[PDB]
Every structure is written in structure tokens, then in C-alpha cells.
Design a protein around this ligand. Sequence first.
Ligand SMILES: OC[C@H]1O[C@H](O[C@H]2[C@H](O)[C@@H](O)[C@@H](O[C@H]3[C@H](O)[C@@H](O)[C@@H](O[C@H]4[C@H](O)[C@@H](O)[C@@H](O)O[C@@H]4CO)O[C@@H]3CO)O[C@@H]2CO)[C@H](O)[C@@H](O)[C@@H]1O
Length: 375
Amino acid sequence: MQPKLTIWCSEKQVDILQKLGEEFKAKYGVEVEVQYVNFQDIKSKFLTAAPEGQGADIIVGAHDWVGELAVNGLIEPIPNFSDLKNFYETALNAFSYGGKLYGIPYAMEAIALIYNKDYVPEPPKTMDELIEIAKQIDEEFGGEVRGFITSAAEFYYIAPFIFGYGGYVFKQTEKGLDVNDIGLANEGAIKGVKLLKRLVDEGILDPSDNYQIMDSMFREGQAAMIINGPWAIKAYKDAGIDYGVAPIPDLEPGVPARPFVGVQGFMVNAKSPNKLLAIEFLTSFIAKKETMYRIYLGDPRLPSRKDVLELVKDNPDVVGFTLSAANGIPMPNVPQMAAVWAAMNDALNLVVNGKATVEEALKNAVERIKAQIQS
Ligand SMILES: OC[C@H]1O[C@H](O[C@H]2[C@H](O)[C@@H](O)[C@@H](O[C@H]3[C@H](O)[C@@H](O)[C@@H](O[C@H]4[C@H](O)[C@@H](O)[C@@H](O)O[C@@H]4CO)O[C@@H]3CO)O[C@@H]2CO)[C@H](O)[C@@H](O)[C@@H]1O
């Protein structure tokens, strides 16, 4: 009886993984099934389905998930394999927790300014310049082209402002992250969210702006500038957008934006009876140079396998996202990160909708995060 491996991944990886799965099946007789799952639903679906025996054998996603999934016993440690040396240790360590490796990373990433050269031939260097250019576009195009869009109420996309001014999630200490020292309502976080509020107040961002609006308007030629990541670029290129990638404009003189840095990788379901075969598929096939490069070609981010990064290092998009990531802060992978996102999203929703001051919204967010961490 032929065995089967099921993979959950976002829309970005479906095509390339489908093709690789067909190749693995032709060679070995192992059925491979690639199932699209909305990215923000992968982890929550896996938390629900994995204990019920209904989780995918392999999930694809971000390294911040690792600590929560590892301590809950839901993802399987990956034993050493011959290709392990070929991956950057920073990428492997992002997928490591409690001394063990829990995923095969394929790329790192960070959001950046993505701009349509038809409207913005040369990218702004400061946020003050970006604000002026966006206002000009909003006026000159009578509302048919948005000057600037990002996901206004989503913490992941506002983090570059929060961190640029000195906010932080958990305090970085010489003994690791201090989950009892949260910096998402310090004066830097407040100044960064006050910049978000300025963008809304000056009409550059609309209270309803979200990921789908940003992504779709940019892909359809209706947005001059966005803040988004390298996962979005292939769709823009196929749609015919003449885009560029640049670091997010400095928040003010001498204060660069500092985005989250994320690592994307393949994790194995520890509850799956196929976990040994899933590991074999990842280490013997997915981890290889050609396969990792084919994944890049299908889903272009910043490759984690060193010899693949060398192939792409001169691509202007790779150069642009690397410049943005150079100022960035890696997302924590500790289990306590699960308590962070929803509280911060809720606080930013209140701010962009004029429902609370920045200081009150962030203060309440941190009390919510702390209470959840403490149990
Ligand atoms: O409680 C709210 C939600 O919190 C958790 O979601 C987190 C993620 O775990 C983080 O990784 C991050 O998500 C980023 C992601 O890192 C980044 O790559 C990008 O995601 C892309 C994706 O790579 C791409 O393949 C494609 O699917 O498009 C996505 C963008 O739409 O952007 C994400 C941010 O949107 O931050 C979120 C929280 O915002 C938790 O996993 C969720 O289950 C939970 O609902």
C-alpha cells in the first residue's frame, strides 16, 4: 500500500511543492499532497488538528511558531543530516528550540518599501518625503491610485516603526529574551505608533487598510508604494508591475525603520505516523541545492541554503530586501510569542479607528500580554 505525505502551506508555495511532490511520487511511489491553507490559519488549524490525528505530515511556515509547537510536543526534532552544513546557522537556529532542530529553513525575509516605478520612479528616502509623495499621488489621481498602503492595524507591519524608535517585544539580555520585560508600550513604541496615527490622521492610510487591500491594489496597478515582503513580488511581476524594492524610509533623521526578520521553513508533525518518511523527504530531496533554488524561483525570498543565496545575491530584489533586513530584529520563537500578536493587533485597531489614545491602547495591550504569559 503506497504511503502518503500531506503538506499544508500558504498559496505562495503550492505550485512548486506540487511539482516537487509529483517528482518524488514518480521516483519513489510515495503520494504527495499539497494542501493550501491560509497562512494565518496554518498554526491554529495545526494546534487543533494535530492532537486529533488530522494534522498534515509537514507544515510550512514561520520560525516564530517553533517554541510553542515544540513545547506542546507537536513538531518533531530533525536529526542531523548530510546537508545540514549547507544551511546558514542563523536560519537553522531560528528553527531550533531547547537544543534541538525543528525545521528545515528555505528562506529568510523582512518587509520593505515596494514601489511602482510608473508612479514613483525613485523611492523616498524619509517618511516625510514618503508622506508628501503619497499625498501628491492621492490628489493627482483623484482617488483611483493610492499613494501609500500597508496593513495599518496589523502589528507585524507596524513593527518597523515601533522597533525603529526603541520599542521591543521581549528584552534582549545576555541570558536570552526576558519574557517578563515587555517593551511594546515604552516611549519608543508610543512614538512609533504615533507615527502610524499620523499617517491615518493625515489621510495617507485609511482605517480599513489591511493586507488584502494593500496586496491587491498594488498588484492591480492602483498603489504607488506599500510596505510588504518578498512573498508578494512574484505576483506583482506576473501582473506586469514595474516595481522596485527599497528599505522603508527612515522614520526621522538618524532613526531607521527596523522590521521583523522571519525565517520560513518545513516542520514535521510529531503526531504523524509518517514522520520518518516526512523527515526523509525534507532532508534527502527538499534540502538539496537544486530543489532549494527551484523553491526560490517559485517563491522568491532570501535563500537560507548558502550556495543558493550565492546564486541570487545580485538580484535587485534580493539586494533590496537584504538592505531592509540588515536593520531588522528576528521574531522571537519562544512559546510566549503566541500571546503577543492578537493583543497588539487589537491595540492598533483601536488606534487607527480613533477609539483610544496610543498610550492607553499600548498600555492595555502589554497588560493583556503579561496576564496571558503569567497564565
Ligand atoms: O493571533 C493572530 C495570529 O498570530 C500568529 O500569526 C503571526 C505569524 O505567526 C507571524 O509569522 C507573522 O506572520 C507574518 C509572516 O511571518 C510573513 O511571512 C507574512 O506572511 C505571508 C506568508 O509568508 C506568505 O506565504 C503568504 O501567505 O502571505 C502572508 C501574508 O499574508 O506576513 C505575516 C503577517 O501577516 O505575524 C502573524 C500575526 O500577524 C499566528 O500564527 C496566527 O495563527 C494567529 O491567528
